[PDB]
Amino acid sequence: SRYLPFEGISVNDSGSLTLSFPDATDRQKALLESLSDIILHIRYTIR
Amino acid sequence: QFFDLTQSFCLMAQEALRRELTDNGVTFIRGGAWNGTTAGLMAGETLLLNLAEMEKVWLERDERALEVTRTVSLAQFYQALSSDNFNLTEKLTQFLREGKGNVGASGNELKLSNRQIEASVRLSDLKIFSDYPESLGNTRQLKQVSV
Amino acid sequence: GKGNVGASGNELKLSNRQIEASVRLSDLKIFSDYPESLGNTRQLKQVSVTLPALVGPYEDIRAVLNYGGSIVMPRGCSAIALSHGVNDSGQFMLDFNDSRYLPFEGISVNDSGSLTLSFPDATDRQKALLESLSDIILHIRYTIR
Amino acid sequence: QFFDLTQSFCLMAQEALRRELTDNGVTFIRGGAWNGTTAGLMAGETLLL
């Protein structure tokens, strides 16, 4: 019934999607070293 | 008091309709519902007519949109950048082994600000418009994002 | 990078940089699958596409299935976009009890129009995927009344 | 204004029914709901019928 996050953003927007990992020095250091890459599954609609 | 609340609801519903149709120019709550000639009466009937007009335009311009999925791998996207590119995994390992780092252009960037790592991807640099022909629709908007 | 084979309606062509495979709906002879009794009104309900290709991970098939007939159809219900090709229904979540019409619903199963599957940028970005493609499968769910 | 909107809704519902039954010949909104003899009244009752 309510909007999903990021819904309605034009796919041609000049804005940026930012992925932030806090405590990346620090508590998430091992996880980020073990990280391979980042994948975004973006579902959008055409009208 | 109730007319004020009701007109607030009508205006926010009109904003919802504008967002749904992606057409900010449509106006249905045209004001003057509370008129001095009738001591405030018929505001309800005026607002009912406006809501009916909104529903009619919504039903007449409703469309079933094409639902597309795009998978964007950040490492490939950063490597394929034309001007300012870098390698995601090696830059991440370097920025972790030494607690500083900043690479890329404004919008397409990998940085280590404070103790928090930030990877920014510009939405237009994904060229999601070119994935499908210029026909089939001009309004292409996100619906959901997963990581 | 040129090609045109088959008859108008039952065709495989490479127009511009986009491949198109058109199949006439009446040439499937779906009316003969069941006896002339059991109902005279046999209409489509839902069309899905399976593309058994060897697509790499993080790569999406980009196909468009369109209907080219003269039947009046609701807005946005004559075309679907295919992005994974494994029983792809073109919708985020398929619901046969939906309040709105599904794409290709209500088209007479003996229509003279054609379903066209178009692969854009097949010269181009989808070349390897289309060579790795084996064939194309249509799952046509229809109703008899 | 409301009678115009309501009759438009009635016509599109009738088109939905025609699509559902695959019978374009059925007609239910036959016109004359807004009659001059009654100054537009009873139009709602006609449309309800």
User: Residues C54, C60, C62, CA angle at the centre, nearest 5°?
Assistant: 105
Residue whose tokens read 């309605």: A8
Closest residue of chain C to B67, computed from CA coordinates = C91
Interhelix angle D2-21/B43-60, nearest 10 degrees:
30
CA distance C37 to A39: 53
In the block, tokens 């009619």 appear at B56
Residues of chain D with Cβ-Cβ distance to B51 below 8 Å are none
Residue A12 to residue B124: CA distance in whole angstroms: 5
A41 vs B71: CB contact, 8 Å cut-off? yes
Which chain D positions have a beta carbon within 8 Å of C106's beta carbon?
A: 19
The DSSP letter of residue C32 is G
Task: State the Cα–Cα distance between residues A41 and A32, nearest whole angstrom.
Answer: 20
Q: Look at D19 and C106 and tell me if their CB atoms are within 8 Å.
A: yes
Contacts of A21 in chain B (CB under 8 A): 116-118
Give pairs for D41-48: CB < 8 Å, separation 24+: D43/D3, D43/D6, D44/D6, D47/D6, D47/D7, D47/D10
Residue B133, min C-alpha distance to chain C (Å): 7
CA C5 to chain centroid: 19
The DSSP output letter for C104 is T
Based on its alpha-carbon atoms, the radius of gyration of chain B, rounded to whole angstroms, reads 25
Assess whether chains D and A touch, using the rule of 3 or more C-beta pairs within 8 angstroms. no
Distance of CA B125 to the CA centre of its chain: 17
Question: How many Å is the Cα radius of gyration of chain C?
Answer: 16
Contacting chains of C (3 CB pairs or more, <8 Å) are A, B, D
d(CA A2, CA A8): 12
Chain center to CA of A15: 13
- Cross-chain Cβ contact A43/B144 below 8 Å: yes
C81 membership: H or E segment, kind and range: strand C79-82
Enumerate the residues of chain B whose CB falls inside 8 A of the CB of residue D12.
Answer: 59
- C23: which 2 tokens? 């199949």
The DSSP letter of residue C33 is: G
Nearest Cα neighbor of D6 from C4, A12, C97, D14 is D14
Distance separating alpha carbons of residues B41 and B107, to the nearest angstrom? 54
> Which are the residues after which chain D is interrupted (C to N > 2.5 Å)?
none
Q: Enumerate the β-bridge partners of residue B108.
A: B105
Residues 6+ away with beta carbon under 8 Å from A28: A21, A22
CA B138 to CA B97: how far, in whole Å?
46
Backbone angles phi, psi at B29, to 5 degrees: -80, 90
Amino acid at site C139:
H
Distance of alpha carbon B34 from alpha carbon B4, whole angstroms: 10
Q: Work out the minimum CA distance from B49 to partner chain D, whole angstroms.
A: 6
3-state SS, A1-47, equals CCCCCCCCCECCCCCEEEEEECCCCCCCHHHHHHCCCCEEEEEEEEC
What are the chain A neighbours of B67 within 8 Å (beta carbons)? Answer: 43, 45
Å between B79 CA and nearest CA of chain A: 12
d(CA C33, nearest CA chain B) in Å: 31
**Interface size between B and C, measured as CB pairs under 8 A:** 45
CA distances from C69 to C26, C91, C104 (A): 11, 22, 11
Pairing mode, strands C42-50 and C137-144 = antiparallel
Collect all residues from C whose CB is shorter than 8 A from any CB in D. Answer: 41, 43, 106, 145
CB atoms within 10 A of CB C8: 8
Which residues of chain B does C76 touch, with a Cβ-Cβ cutoff of 8 Å?
63-66
Structural determination approach: cryo-EM
D43, D31 Cβ separation under 8 angstroms = no
Handedness of CA C13, C18, C24, C27 (dihedral sign): positive
Q: At B72, which helix (H) or strand (E)?
A: strand B66-73
How distant is the Cα of C39 from the closest Cα of chain A, in angstroms?
Answer: 36
Residues of A in contact with C80 (CB under 8 A): none
- D interface with C, Cβ–Cβ < 8 A, is 19, 22
Dihedral over Cα of B128, A6, A39, C135: its sign: negative
